[PDB]
Assembly symmetry: D2
Homo-oligomer: 251 residues x 4
């Protein structure tokens, strides 16, 4: 009776119960999805296993997206358990700490740029490509972005470049996978309460709804985009940010 | 446990079972909402009363948005039935025939421009303002737009200017009403009769959209039901494309 | 050798030496344009005649854009002086005061909305239409907008709607007039004399400074010239880069 | 009396008299700038010295942007001739053939992605940063982009992602360099005369019903490089006969 009843959805980047990924997993399970999860390094096997149990699942698989072999092995393993995949949630995203603090050029190096683009941008369509052989015709792929892709935000720096490439990959993936029937979207999420205070307070004071978004609100938006309720929606970057993107705040 | 359970929603622009408003009404009713409807002219009262009955409702009210007396009376009447309003769907718009055909300048006149903007853009925030005193604190207001607001589309002409002004009102309304808790959004819907040039747009979108298909009132209805609900509580000031991804490509090359 | 040499350009909206239109007039005259000017109300005839003389021109014409008769008489009048028009600068824009102060809904009325859209948006394509029979095939039409068209700015309110319609008219005009060869563009100018809005822009713009009417004027002159023959349907921000950031954090 | 009189400007990506960089070079020279040029590989030193000579210049320097040492050496060299630099034109951009033809996923590989972003996106702010110690306070940096950054265009594929990253770099650079006074912009240029189809479509559906020329892109570039554009930064200016602004072909 839930709006994702019978959908099988693989989620990446579940590291804690304050994750956007956790919020989405919770919303998805409530609406009747069956879930599977990735984790990075055998050191995190136990932790991810406990999360999966919370969501009524035993399906966890290692996947460091830096490694082509691991990406390919993920879907070979997953296919031994599921005949098809209906949803993928891409919620990973890394830049070296210097590359997203202080001045943009101070933190810029060829390697910092490379890693940021490889993990935060390349990995989405790499996963989509590796999943394609087992995707259902009406599957939905979801990634996460930030307003820093669209306008210059202090400190976001190299990550802003990488998220811009990510949101472009959303549009190109939509075209590539869409004749089959597969949809591809992103949520551009506002910051979540858990110098970053400057941002949280500013957003709370300047957003149209005068409040920060919660992982529950982002989770519900993601569940919607993963479902057949959203079958008319693809190639979209949906803002879930209390309307902050639509104003000139503070002015 | 429909996701709009207990919500009270007023819908404008329901003229047929092919209407975008009809699709939104069906989805809202499926998810547990109670519905009320508007109509223009006593000559449509019997027909909207029939449609309302189809959605288990007896609540219909005249509202020609060209007339301040009708806009100012609507929510006074509604209030006698419902103490508060949780949703409003604005799905109305008009421009004179010549203002949406051929060359943009040939069809341009002051009165054509005035009408198009009065009915298609001004009416949305006008209804919001009249509704304000009875809106629930978590109410949600939804309007409908088109890609012609964003980029120039053949024939759309003066309606493109009025949809741009409508999309701007979504952002300004979101700010005005947001502290209270009210959300304001638009759906930019793809094309959904026998109009030859419109048939060409439908064919182009089917061949060139990412999903290779035109959208349906069911798909637009569900998106609308979502934006109307607490599942969309983090979403305001948004223009959401429900158009098979068409706005995101350069088609035809 | 000026990049607008020979170009005949009509400018609306010149009310003082602080007007955006005055900066564009300066930049255009510097690059060799011949200039003509409009004014609203017989009361302002002498003061516009004086600005015109500063720019070496005697061509001044009444034009209240609310009045169809004035719009059509403007072009009948100008045609007796100039066989063809190479440029038009639309720098007019008005909303009743309550419609651009305070809360959006408090100032919303059907008549406030109608006036704001009629003067600030409809007048641009209306002037284009009246001008068309005398426009040179490579003419250039320029209007002025503001970031308030794109994102909700405090107090901008009904003018944010009007400027969104105006920017849309730039794209539809460009399509309508483009096969003949006429280009159509907008500059989205930063704020220009409130001290707090200006201070926020000075502190948060990438260039850490407010734009000047000399900077907007030069960008205008460029778009008016054949140097910009590849540019149409564009909304160019001339605002010290303020549109491109999230300030205040 | 040109509008770039006295400005010293460095141009990358000049490979032929049909290069966008050649058009921008012509316009800048016309407007009074002094030019310097980069080239890739010993193999091309002669052809660039010639082009340079066409524009009254003997300042040519090797610079493969895949290489940190070469980027740092360019400005070390340049400084021995120019005490300060007023403009930079970044007009380079590569993706492997497979990564910019056919289906997006067929051409996607990790290395294709890496190369496209490294040469077409990263290189711009990389040159900015290495130039910074000799940049004049009113300098202007310009890069070249394409509509495929904003919307999905057939075959553009991995390059669309790299151009999106480049355009974002324009906004971050503008903030980083703006307090000093340096401006940073992009021109999103239309295609210049599979590709035949693209040019035909633009000529049929653009508002001006014509493709843009390197002379039109050049004049826009010279403007953005000049003090005439001193109010303009963080901007992606379309020079594409209005094509970006329409839904063509319906
Ligand atoms: Cl007044």
């Amino acid at each position: 009776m839930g709006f994702l009843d019978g959908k099988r959805i693989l989620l990446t980047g579940l590291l804690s119960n304050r994750s956007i990924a956790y919020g989405i997993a919770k919303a998805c399970k409530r609406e009747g999805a069956e879930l599977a999860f990735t984790y990075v390094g055998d050191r995190f096997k136990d932790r991810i296993t406990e999360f999966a149990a919370e969501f009524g699942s035993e399906l966890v698989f290692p996947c460091d997206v830096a490694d082509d072999a691991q990406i390919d092995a993920l879907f070979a393993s997953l296919k031994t358990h599921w005949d098809s995949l209906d949803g993928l949630v891409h919620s990973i995203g890394f830049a070296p700490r210097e590359a997203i603090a202080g001045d943009f050029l101070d933190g810029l190096t060829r390697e910092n740029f490379r890693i940021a683009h490889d993990i935060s941008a390349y990995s989405f369509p790499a996963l989509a490509k590796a999943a394609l052989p087992m995707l259902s015709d009406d599957a939905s792929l979801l990634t996460l972005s930030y307003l820093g892709a669209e306008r210059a935000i202090p400190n976001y720096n190299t990550m802003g470049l990488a998220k811009a490439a990510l949101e472009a990959s959303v549009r190109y993936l939509a075209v590539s996978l869409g004749a089959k029937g597969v949809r591809v979207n992103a949520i551009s999420a506002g910051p979540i309460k858990t110098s970053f205070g400057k941002i949280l307070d500013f957003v709370e004071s300047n957003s149209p709804l005068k409040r920060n978004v919660t992982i529950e609100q982002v989770g519900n938006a993601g569940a919607f985009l993963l479902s057949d309720l959203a079958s008319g929606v693809t190639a979209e970057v949906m803002h879930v940010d209390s309307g902050f993107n639509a104003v000139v705040g503070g002015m």
